[PDB]
């Protein structure tokens, strides 16, 4: 169901990548792989990813401006019951990564490792 070395979980296939990229570069990277940055929209996926990696990795969450809503790459706003997992940030930290079970806003132009998602 998944390309070689992509991990089969729930609906989807997950790829992990240790290239130090900005959020936008990471978005493009996933797009180049016919995939998207991760949507961490429930407790199950939090635990799956947490069990698998301890390194900071970008996810597909960003906001247009510090006073606008956080959205996933699919256009959806972050779910109510996932706010527990989102730490607060400063202004002009408009992109988020996942680290050891929580999501953290940071500078979009900082570089981090990443992971991508596509359908099986």
């Amino acid at each position: 169901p998944c390309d070689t070395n992509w991990r089969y979980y729930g609906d989807s296939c997950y790829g992990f990548f240790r290239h130090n990229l900005t959020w936008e570069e990471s978005k493009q990277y996933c797009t180049d792989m016919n995939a998207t940055l991760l949507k961490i929209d429930n407790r199950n996926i939090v635990e799956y990813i947490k069990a698998r990696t301890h390194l900071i990795r970008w996810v597909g969450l960003s906001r247009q401006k510090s006073n606008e809503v956080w959205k996933w790459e699919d256009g959806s706003v972050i779910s109510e019951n996932m706010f527990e997992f989102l730490e607060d940030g400063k202004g002009n930290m408009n992109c988020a990564y996942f680290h050891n079970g929580k999501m953290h806003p940071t500078f979009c132009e900082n570089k981090h490792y990443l992971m991508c998602e596509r359908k099986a």
Partner: peptide, 10 residues
Amino acid sequence: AEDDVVTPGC
């Protein structure tokens, strides 16, 4: 699993 993957040179 994902973090310590050591890959051979080509």
